[PDB]
Amino acid sequence: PVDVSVSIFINKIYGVNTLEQTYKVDGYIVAQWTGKPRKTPGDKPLIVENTQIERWINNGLWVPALEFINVVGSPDTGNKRLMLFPDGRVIYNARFLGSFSNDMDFRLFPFDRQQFVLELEPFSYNNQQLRFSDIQVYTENIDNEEIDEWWIRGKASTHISDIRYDHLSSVQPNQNEFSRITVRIDAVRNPSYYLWSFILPLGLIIAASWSVFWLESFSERLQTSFTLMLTVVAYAFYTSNILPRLPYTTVIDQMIIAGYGSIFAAILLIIFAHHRQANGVEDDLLIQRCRLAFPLGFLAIGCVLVI
Amino acid sequence: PVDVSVSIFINKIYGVNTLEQTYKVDGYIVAQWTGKPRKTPGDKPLIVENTQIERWINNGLWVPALEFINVVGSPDTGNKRLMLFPDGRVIYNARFLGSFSNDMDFRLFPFDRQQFVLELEPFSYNNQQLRFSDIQVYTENIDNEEIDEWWIRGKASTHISDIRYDHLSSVQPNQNEFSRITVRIDAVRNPSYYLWSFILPLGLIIAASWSVFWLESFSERLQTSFTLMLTVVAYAFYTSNILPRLPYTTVIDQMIIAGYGSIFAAILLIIFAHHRQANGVEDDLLIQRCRLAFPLGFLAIGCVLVI
Amino acid sequence: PVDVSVSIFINKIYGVNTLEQTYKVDGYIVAQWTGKPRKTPGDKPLIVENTQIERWINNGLWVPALEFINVVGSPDTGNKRLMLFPDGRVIYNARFLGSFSNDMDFRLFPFDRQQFVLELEPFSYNNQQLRFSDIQVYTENIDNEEIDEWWIRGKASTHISDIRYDHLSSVQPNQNEFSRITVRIDAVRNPSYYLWSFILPLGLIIAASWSVFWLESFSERLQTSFTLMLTVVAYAFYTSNILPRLPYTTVIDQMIIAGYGSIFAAILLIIFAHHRQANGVEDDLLIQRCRLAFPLGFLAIGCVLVI
Amino acid sequence: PVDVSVSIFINKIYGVNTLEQTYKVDGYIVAQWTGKPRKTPGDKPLIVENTQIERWINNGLWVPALEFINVVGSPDTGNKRLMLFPDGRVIYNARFLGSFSNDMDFRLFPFDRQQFVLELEPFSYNNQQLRFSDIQVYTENIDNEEIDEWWIRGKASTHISDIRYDHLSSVQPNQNEFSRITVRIDAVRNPSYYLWSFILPLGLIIAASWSVFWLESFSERLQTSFTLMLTVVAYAFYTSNILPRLPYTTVIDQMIIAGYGSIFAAILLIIFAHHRQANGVEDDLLIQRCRLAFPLGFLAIGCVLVI
Amino acid sequence: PVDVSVSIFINKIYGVNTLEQTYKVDGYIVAQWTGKPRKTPGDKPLIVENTQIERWINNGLWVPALEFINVVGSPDTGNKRLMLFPDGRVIYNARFLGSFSNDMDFRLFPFDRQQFVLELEPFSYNNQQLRFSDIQVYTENIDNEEIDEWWIRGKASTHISDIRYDHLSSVQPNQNEFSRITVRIDAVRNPSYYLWSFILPLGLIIAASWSVFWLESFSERLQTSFTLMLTVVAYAFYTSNILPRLPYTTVIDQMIIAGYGSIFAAILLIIFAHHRQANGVEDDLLIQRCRLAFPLGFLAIGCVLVI
Ligand SMILES: CCCCCCCC/C=C/CCCCCCCC(=O)O[C@H](COC(=O)CCCCCCCCCCCCCCC)COP(=O)(O)OC[C@@H](O)CO
Ligand SMILES: CCCCCCCC/C=C/CCCCCCCC(=O)O[C@H](COC(=O)CCCCCCCCCCCCCCC)COP(=O)(O)OC[C@@H](O)CO
Ligand SMILES: CCCCCCCC/C=C/CCCCCCCC(=O)O[C@H](COC(=O)CCCCCCCCCCCCCCC)COP(=O)(O)OC[C@@H](O)CO
Ligand SMILES: CCCCCCCC/C=C/CCCCCCCC(=O)O[C@H](COC(=O)CCCCCCCCCCCCCCC)COP(=O)(O)OC[C@@H](O)CO
Ligand SMILES: CCCCCCCC/C=C/CCCCCCCC(=O)O[C@H](COC(=O)CCCCCCCCCCCCCCC)COP(=O)(O)OC[C@@H](O)CO
Known part of the structure; x- marks a missing residue:
């Protein structure tokens, strides 16, 4: 299994809509893995911008599709970038805007305390083909802020787990377990x-x-x-x-x-x-x-x- | 007729809007059939991601288009995937978000009891060219939950039928009958x-x-x-x-x-x-x-x- | 002039918004004409799905563009299909969702009586190049129903006329008259x-x-x-x-x-x-x-x- | 400079939203110029529909991009058509839906009197490369009507002017003046x-x-x-x-x-x-x-x- | 590092929504740099319109992607244009509509005083590969105006800085600093x-x-x-x-x-x-x-x- 090393940068959290329990997260995601070595122009890394990556995927480059599990809709992917190195390693950088959803418990309503969750998972490759090595979360732009009425308390928790799926059990008999990343941010209502x-x-x-x-x-x-x-x-x-x-x-x-x-x-x-x-x-x-x-x-x- | 074996995985039901009687369903659909054998790289199944499938359909691969009959709009198809096996069988996996509609009867309004229906049908092929073998529905994420005020009671009912169409009778004289899948989920208002x-x-x-x-x-x-x-x-x-x-x-x-x-x-x-x-x-x-x-x-x- | 034979299948009418006098119509449209004979694989008709039709139009197939005149926006075309026969005739099937508009007269407001109109017209070809032979309307799914407060009374009226345009008179001097189809459905408010x-x-x-x-x-x-x-x-x-x-x-x-x-x-x-x-x-x-x-x-x- | 001859056909004005001072205009635009002579199939003009024009622009046909200056968003371009003549002249026809904006002065509010303005301009070519010869406006569908509470009074005024731009002065030193078309329609509130x-x-x-x-x-x-x-x-x-x-x-x-x-x-x-x-x-x-x-x-x- | 010289033309500010603290900016952006000399048809600059630029980027032209940092969503890019000169310099002109966001402080609410900020940054190239030389802002269309209740006071402030990023520190060890442009406009509530x-x-x-x-x-x-x-x-x-x-x-x-x-x-x-x-x-x-x-x-x- 190839070892992907994700790094998420939260740019802002906004639009916290308690009626539907969604919230909009804007940010960047940087995945990185190591493949076979290649020859690039010069001795320098090569940058492939958006709408050019497809010419590289058609020729046969392996770029996995990471999806956000708890998204309401599809994430508004803005620009995306692919950096290829001569030593062999590939870095996929992308910008996302999403309306994520979490199970909120408004039992103590004005004095509430929720947490905002990002769940990220490969769409096609199980953990015998793609494994998440680690995740860093650089939530420095919203470290101790007040977005509208939410104080963002402390650092961001990260976790890597394995989720076993059953609708894929008939098509993938004994290998239907997917590596997953969870990011949790604790917020306290004002x-x-x-x-x-x-x-x-x-x-x-x-x-x-x-x-x-x-x-x-x-x-x-x-x-x-x-x-x-x-x-x-x-x-x-x-x-x-x-x-x-x-x-x-x-x-x-x-x-x-x-x-x-x-x-x-x-x-x-x-x-x-x-x-x-x-x-x-x-x-x-x-x-x-x-x-x-x-x-x-x-x-x-x-x-x-x-x- | 080729025998497709559908499997639907309901991820969440939300946004139940009683004013227009729509509801948003998010989930995955896995269709699977068997074609002629082919040579894949190695002895292993080959995965074709989104925006690459078109290069395979142009070369001549048979991928049918399944549509949701009772959708309000078009389903927000996210990622999609196509797994081709050397033994011959093809598996089409896709992620959908849709605003489905059903006939709701609010006669007993606070103590209401509705059901959420998904209807799936081939768009082009009648039952002499494409037949649904079976459907499993893996509604385990919403088995006994409370989405906002709806308890999801029991399991999900499935059915396979044949719907005969009349506007296609002049263009397809005696073969205008389409195989259809129905999925019903019983919900009780809180x-x-x-x-x-x-x-x-x-x-x-x-x-x-x-x-x-x-x-x-x-x-x-x-x-x-x-x-x-x-x-x-x-x-x-x-x-x-x-x-x-x-x-x-x-x-x-x-x-x-x-x-x-x-x-x-x-x-x-x-x-x-x-x-x-x-x-x-x-x-x-x-x-x-x-x-x-x-x-x-x-x-x-x-x-x-x-x- | 080539003789197109339209057939419209109304699937549901909903979202009747009296503030702006629009209404959403969902359904299918089946156009059909006869061209030169061709050789298809076998002796059987050939089905060309969505996003494949373009490969046939580039090679030189004549597919006209029919537009809805009274639409607010652009119709959300879902799937589309093209059936080519060896004897020569072509059938274009498509699914539409549209927000149509009509002139409503709310003079007797609770006891109102309106009608819902679909107007269909070729975009490029006048009636010396494309002529509508007939239209059938299969409004059987909403024959005698109550959508929200509208009883759909009787059958659906159809009409074929010729509309003469003046902004095209300088570019098309004596041939600027377009064949048009009108579909009217009478609805009574509850x-x-x-x-x-x-x-x-x-x-x-x-x-x-x-x-x-x-x-x-x-x-x-x-x-x-x-x-x-x-x-x-x-x-x-x-x-x-x-x-x-x-x-x-x-x-x-x-x-x-x-x-x-x-x-x-x-x-x-x-x-x-x-x-x-x-x-x-x-x-x-x-x-x-x-x-x-x-x-x-x-x-x-x-x-x-x-x- | 090549002489383009615009002709605008207003189909309906609706959605006059006084809170944001926008209004939605639906209609057709017909531009027309004369290029070098060409050989078409037969002695007849050739019609190129939407999504085919690109194959002609790639081969080297000169089609200018006209934009609407006062639009809120991007105009929902529906169908578009390109008629090429053997004698040499080209006609570009397109259908637009736009949310235009104008400076409204609600000083006398129930007895108001506004005007609806369409401003059209080439995006790339100054008046040394593209010049508007004339504009006709065929506002016959809304000549003396009552859309919701607006009487459309009189005919539609047209004007052709030259607007000088300054952000293009460093990149285009002495030629940064663009030909512009203005269309004004007087409306009186009911x-x-x-x-x-x-x-x-x-x-x-x-x-x-x-x-x-x-x-x-x-x-x-x-x-x-x-x-x-x-x-x-x-x-x-x-x-x-x-x-x-x-x-x-x-x-x-x-x-x-x-x-x-x-x-x-x-x-x-x-x-x-x-x-x-x-x-x-x-x-x-x-x-x-x-x-x-x-x-x-x-x-x-x-x-x-x-x- | 190649020296890009940005010039922004604000066309209108509108839709100032104090509930979410967003505002919509419409305008043009003109970037300009100097590359290797090339042979153009004649001795004249060559204009490449929208959807043609891609044919030039595929062949190997260097066009950087500038992004707006503080945007809510993705900017509705309308037309875009690329002017190539024989002497060597390239000019990229584009039209944007965006919902930007800024930190508003409604402490003195009817007598408020905010400022509208545009932040622009290369997406892929650090300041060892792309450096902003200068920015002019031609805010002449909204110099001293009243959009709805905001007087736009004075001129527009501009600034060029260097922002250091940390999520790119593991993938770009000692060069992860990006050149940035900031545009500030002072507005006073009416x-x-x-x-x-x-x-x-x-x-x-x-x-x-x-x-x-x-x-x-x-x-x-x-x-x-x-x-x-x-x-x-x-x-x-x-x-x-x-x-x-x-x-x-x-x-x-x-x-x-x-x-x-x-x-x-x-x-x-x-x-x-x-x-x-x-x-x-x-x-x-x-x-x-x-x-x-x-x-x-x-x-x-x-x-x-x-x-
Ligand atoms: C003759 C007798 C007179 C009768 C009295 C009539 C009653 C009249 C109202 C009285 C209460 C006054 C409350 C007025 C509230 C004034 C508003 C106020 O204090 O401002 C904010 C606090 O608001 C708030 O907590 C609102 C506080 C209101 C909660 C009420 C608690 C007061 C106790 C009341 C108990 C009952 C009375 C007991 C009397 C025996 C501080 O923002 P701050 O700059 O920090 O930036 C925030 C930072 O997060 C920015 O990032
Ligand atoms: C001096 C005389 C005094 C006069 C009396 C004045 C009247 C004052 C109000 C009285 C009624 C009190 C009702 C207050 C309701 C308290 C609110 C409450 O009980 O909480 C919820 C039930 O709510 C509810 O069913 C709301 C129940 C209200 C329905 C009223 C029925 C009470 C009978 C009333 C008949 C008439 C009175 C008869 C008197 C002779 C339980 O949530 P739970 O944690 O399970 O999680 C749910 C799970 O699904 C999470 O997933
Ligand atoms: C001590 C004295 C007492 C004072 C009296 C106080 C006044 C109190 C109210 C009285 C009127 C009662 C009206 C209550 C209406 C009950 C509601 C009702 O009847 O239900 C619906 C009809 O609704 C309706 O037409 C609503 C009907 C209301 C219209 C009122 C007409 C009644 C005449 C009133 C004239 C003035 C009084 C004259 C007294 C001298 C039938 O749905 P249905 O299953 O068919 O499915 C529909 C199908 O289309 C499903 O697809
Ligand atoms: C015992 C004493 C009794 C006390 C009196 C109590 C007061 C009771 C109300 C009185 C006023 C009646 C007004 C009712 C208005 C009736 C409604 C009406 O007239 O209909 C429309 C006009 O509406 C309208 O201009 C609304 C007109 C209302 C404006 C009021 C002016 C009347 C003068 C009032 C001055 C003060 C009184 C002076 C008394 C000394 C005509 O649509 P029309 O078919 O043309 O199609 C339009 C075309 O554009 C379709 O395309
Ligand atoms: C028998 C005794 C009688 C009792 C009195 C009863 C009270 C009755 C109301 C009185 C106040 C009248 C206020 C009416 C306001 C009239 C409305 C008005 O003046 O119009 C606008 C100003 O509005 C405004 O500032 C609104 C101004 C209202 C603020 C009130 C201040 C007046 C002082 C009040 C202090 C308390 C009274 C003290 C009495 C001792 C000017 O737009 P302008 O063309 O420039 O274009 C704008 C440009 O930006 C366009 O681009």
Whole structure:
């Protein structure tokens, strides 16, 4: 098996689209192997640019096709270059733009922590014909940066493994195992914009919802409660386009559902207070003094939603 | 007829867009047949990569064109590979990305159950010239997964049939029947996000709409009813972009229309109560005690909308 | 002139985008003519697949280029095939996806009735060099179906005509007339979703707007009228993205403008009733008994907006 | 210099996107020049279709490349054709689809008046090597039509000029002047949809805002004013997506800002009336009789915003 | 090293998309170097158009590939041209459309000031094989213009530097340094549309929020405060799509958060005034005379948010 030595240079990560869990990676890939010696013009390496490589592949040069496994579409290959040396070794350099995809887990949404994965694999040659020796990843352009809201933490992890395929088992009986390269980059979401735009106003709205019990008139309490319900419905719409649509419940989601529960609890409490009159002559003191109990225990419910 | 043996490997299903009823499938297809024996370099199979196959087709190699019938556009074919054996058999491997389309029936919308269909067919050769022997489908990467809200249930069904075409009947009189492969995957929608985001708030709003009859003042009842109508109109907008636009009525749709009916029924009931005065001195007791009847029977109406 | 015999097979119509009045047609086109006899391998017809046809056109085969006149962009030609017979006749089969455009008249918008038109024409050869003999259209896959909200009614009309061009009159003096094929399919919009989503709620809102005159307090009437105006403004936004923007007035549009007129008429009537006091001691009876006149005549206005 | 005689045929103008000030033009271009005489098959002109022209350019035929200067992207060239005559003259016909751009001035927005410009220029040859003799424009398909809201008024103006370039001055010292063709089409916006959808409701809302002074209770006046402010905010959102975002102020914009000013003026006037009590015993007569002054002078302000 | 002399002509800058911080640049690039002398037809320079250059590169002409480093995608290269002179020098002219990206800092958002950067670099040749002599930038078409809201101030800065690469250090040990060209254009945002559309209405809403203390009834103050909170929530939605989502706080953002704080402060102040009764018989004078203190100090807070 011929030993290819990959080197990936990440130029920028951008376009992190949490709705579909894709992200666009731009960069360069440099593969390098050693073949039979050849005669080049002079004693110097020869550079073959894009759309000329095909004239060399037709004449019989061995250039393998490396593909990105987790790409959504096909990578927008820009320029490509092939450097041939007189001593025998070949270097294939190419520029890629891709929309890669990874399994993101938005369980802790504003305080999220994901990782961006590049998976690279030969398309045709198993590990008895092509083996990856090593990979370096030069992620120096995005070492400690803030792309839009993602801090790129630490270095980039690399790994070389062997993936066994089964749809090729009938056509390649006992040799259907392919060498694979994985590159992982840890990114932490910046929670500031959500903190001052989606959590502080919801906290103020929920506290104001608690503040309806200071009224001494029942009808005004009902109309006020419905106005607050309308405002919470406005935030129900206003948070819909932020993140995709998942079985479980995020942090902003808990605040929205807690706001709905607070509005409904206040409405039912004032209805029950209006119905609390046994003979219609008794007034209410203890159930309208929930201005200390209804907030505080609610905060404990918030603790249950946090931990 | 030459016997082709297809094998499809589904890599991921994603981008399930219910508005247009398309879905994107990414994967590999491996066709395989047997031709005349040939002399290859050594005693080993020969691999011909992408953009080299054309040099072999020009010289006279028989490679059929398989097409996907239910595709919206053209499949984004990435790499492709052709393995030729000395014993005679040929293997064509290719990678596809496609936006396929199927007839979806959103009658039970949050609790939906659809299936994703791949239909594959030769473009030029009828079943007297090309016949599909079998198909295996290796859907192991998405066996029991949750792509975004779709559980992929069970294995993948496969079928081989013969489709007879009529626009080719004048050009191919008695042989216009094409062999076809169908692949079906059963998927069940995950109803959780709609359950806690589109059904619980509508239930609370409808119950609060029932709660307007506890007021003892007519004008406040009217103004409260109009505020509730405004909130239900907000959810009328808020549910518009979820699913496409169909003649029949889904589950969230029934809740919205039931909310409109509840608001209008309450308005007409309080107007009729205000008009119920025969001489202007009589008050109302029985028609304002609908706080047990107006909810409960409405729930029975909900049963009619469920079953 | 050589006699081409076209046959079009419509596979599906979808993506009917009323904002730009385009629609996507997917299908196959089969042209067929007769040339000089030739020697094929054996006594059997010869099939030339895509990207091989060019080797036959370079050697001198006559294949005309048929274009779609009313296409927005260029048709996404998928596979194409060329069948050559020993007796002499040639058959060109191709698969197209196109975004076609037609002049749509949304005067009766929910109860609309449009037709989808395909116009096909040789690009280079006038009717002294290429003449269309006939066209069959095999629209059997969409014969009586419901694509999203369009019932496809009846069969597909076909027509063959001659279109005379003037920009080619200086370069082709007396022969600048091109044979053309037109295919028309009649489609009727399904009005159900608009009926239960855009007309019933507007009717309820307008009737509730009529219901403000039962109040006996002037200030509450004004505040109620402004709340109803806010709701009608919400539907003014909610109907904006449904259909494009036209000089005339559709059916939902009339309901929106009628709602605005009802709100303003009620406001002016209650202002005039408050000003109706000649000396400030007289009350109002007849002008507040418009609860029978203000609805009913409004319905007559609706008749004027219908017929 | 060789004399090219261009002839442009506009097929349709559509997709007029005022946000980016682009518009899509579809049509045909027919260039024509005279070269050396040649021998064609027979005594008849020879037609060379698309993807065959390259075989003639490789052998040495002179075909110039005409480009569109003001295009956003690259023109979607469909079919192209080359007619060669035995007497010597060559005719190049091509079909284009382009997204052209022009400097639009939306100062009078619903009653707008723009013009659509096509600029055509040789890419390589200056006017000492290629000169445009004349241009005809056959805009007969869109002569007096209504595309969506644009009336195409009159004929199409044409012009031939010489544009001098400076980045080519170092590489072409005294000959860097290129012949250019300009085509201008005058279009007038159809103001009807904005008239009945964005000006009549704003007029009704502003007049209703004037109508708050008829109330005799201060708190109800304040709450009514805030409800009207909420409605005007709804139209502030509802008008945002219509036209792009410009330093100056359009007609609908003036109505929105005037509505804000009316709400704030009414609020400040009722606050000042409540504070107008010198000793707390005096009531207000003259400042609450602004029901004739506050509308009328406002209309004069509208005149200032019109002229 | 061969000395290339680049000259860039910016035709238009448009599509400045602040959400992703890209901008589209359209223009021409003219590279020029000197090679060995050659024999051309006549004594005149020879022009080689697009799709003909490849026939010259195959025969052995040295044309380097210049790439744009900061491009999002691949530049839409339109026409390209190659002028070869008998004295020996070669001129490569090309037309580009690109979506370039730069690091934008929206700290002072309506009064912003960014710069647009073009970075150009050879793809294959280091500065021992290709060196940039100089660059001129002819930005005369956008010298002092207003594209949509960006004034292009002054001339265009140019710079030539050497960038050292590390992923090429293992394949090119001591020569991995590439010559680079940078072009910077200073642009200032036009703040007018935000001034009259996003700051004046927020100022009026905040001042009206201050105006709630003139009421003498507690329940009406609460309901009024909640209505104002609903309006501020409407502007919270209405400002979301203007600029991307950043850790820090812009100018409109400060106004929105200040509005929320004003609503909550007024609610807490009126609750504390209602609770201020020591025995329930005392009224409030000083804490309701904050109509001079609550605005004025708030303005000082605004100063803290400005400076
Ligand atoms: C003082 C009185 C208080 C008034 C009460 C006010 C009302 C307040 C809200 C109450 C309901 C609480 C619902 C909150 C939902 C909490 C959210 C939640 O449960 O999380 C997910 C389920 O979500 C969901 O099904 C959403 C469930 C919501 C559906 C509501 C059903 C509850 C019954 C309600 C009937 C009416 C009330 C009856 C009272 C008499 C589980 O994700 P899981 O980790 O498994 O990963 C998924 C896996 O697929 C990952 O691959
Ligand atoms: C106490 C008093 C109560 C107050 C009443 C409050 C008001 C409450 C709403 C009432 C109307 C109910 C409408 C609900 C509509 C239910 C939805 C429905 O019917 O389903 C679809 C029809 O939808 C539709 O046409 C929608 C129909 C709605 C149009 C409204 C017409 C009803 C008349 C209304 C005139 C005014 C009232 C008059 C009262 C005096 C049938 O799909 P189908 O399976 O065939 O597959 C289609 C096929 O093409 C698949 O290929
Ligand atoms: C009890 C008192 C009642 C209160 C009144 C309440 C208010 C209620 C609304 C009233 C205005 C009615 C406007 C309704 C507009 C009806 C819609 C309409 O007229 O249709 C189109 C014109 O639209 C339009 O210009 C829209 C016109 C609306 C502009 C408003 C101008 C009317 C004057 C208003 C000044 C203020 C009132 C003054 C009262 C003192 C004609 O398309 P047409 O077939 O030609 O094909 C086009 C061709 O280009 C196809 O190629
Ligand atoms: C009875 C009391 C009445 C209450 C008052 C109610 C409030 C009512 C509104 C008032 C403000 C009026 C603003 C209306 C703005 C009018 C719109 C306008 O002026 O047009 C553009 C400027 O826009 C703009 O800067 C918008 C300017 C608006 C910014 C507001 C500043 C005014 C000060 C406000 C401070 C608070 C008030 C203080 C009162 C004590 C000029 O384009 P120009 O042709 O140059 O081409 C551009 C070139 O770049 C083309 O290439
Ligand atoms: C009379 C009584 C008055 C009532 C009070 C009314 C309420 C009014 C609002 C108050 C909170 C103020 C928050 C305003 C936030 C100001 C905005 C701000 O601080 O700027 C950014 C932080 O944003 C942010 O974290 C947003 C922070 C907001 C989160 C809120 C936490 C504050 C605690 C609140 C708990 C409840 C109150 C408790 C009172 C008892 C810093 O960017 P920085 O330059 O570093 O570059 C980033 C780097 O990554 C660039 O690469």
